């Protein structure tokens, strides 16, 4: 029913926000080999901001990533700011807030719509951030791999799209109920 769908939507919003914040803050996106590891290089696990060496003399020390051709410059800027994943998390938060409001202003039906739009846009922004990250990593030192933070981001995207679908369905049902009641009245 409507109540269970709203409950799932709010749970998904909270879960996606948490997963994306975890992925952004976490530094386990990429497992690779880097020259700056104190001995082609040493194993490293990285993220969006900082990189940590593992299995090396400098084991456990984490250092801020040293980023840095107009398009390459723009890509480096966007990758450094990580504005797209952050925007995804922000939009998920705002959508959850709008859903909670929809749990109060049951009359205003154009709220659970904004929630869905924001969730879908957050999914798109996460896609863009993933593309930017993958593109920027490449350059022109092998057998690299992706960590659980990357898949947390992917899970956040999937959940955001699902809850956007559910919110749009809720809006559909609510508007249909109101319109049928009015016309029949």
């Amino acid at each position: 029913e409507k109540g269970v769908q709203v409950l799932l939507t709010t749970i998904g919003a909270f879960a996606a926000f948490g997963l994306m914040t975890i992925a952004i803050s976490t530094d386990y996106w990429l497992y690779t080999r880097a020259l700056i590891c104190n001995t082609p290089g040493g194993l490293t696990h990285s993220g969006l901001w900082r990189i940590c060496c593992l299995e090396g003399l400098k084991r456990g020390v984490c250092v801020k990533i040293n980023h840095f051709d107009s398009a390459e410059y723009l890509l480096r800027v966007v990758r450094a700011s990580s504005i797209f994943p952050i925007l995804s998390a922000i939009l998920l938060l705002l959508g959850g807030v709008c859903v909670a409001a929809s749990r109060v202003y049951k009359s205003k039906r154009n709220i659970i719509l904004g929630a869905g739009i924001l969730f879908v846009a957050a999914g798109l922004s996460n896609i863009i951030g993933v593309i930017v990250y993958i593109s920027a990593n490449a350059g022109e030192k092998n057998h690299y791999s992706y960590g659980w933070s990357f898949y947390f981001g992917g899970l956040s995207f999937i959940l955001a799209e699902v809850i956007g679908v559910l919110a749009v369905n809720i809006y559909i049902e609510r508007s249909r109920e109101a319109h049928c009641q009015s016309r029949s009245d």
């Binding site: 398009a71 390459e72 350059g139 022109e140």
Partner: protein
């Protein structure tokens, strides 16, 4: 040559240009249009409009 005497050159040369070897360029955004010239793409657009 005013103070010594040379032989005929045993090796002739001249000024030349040294550059770094062109590398596989990092693929550019919108490199998927490279197979066709820009003029073909614009003619495609306007043929779409006209059709």
């Amino acid at each position: 040559e005013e103070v010594i005497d040379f032989s005929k050159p045993f090796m002739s040369l001249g000024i030349s240009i040294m550059i770094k070897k062109p590398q596989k360029s990092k693929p550019g955004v919108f490199s998927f249009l490279d197979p066709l010239a820009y003029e073909i793409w614009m003619c495609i657009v306007f043929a779409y409009i006209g059709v």
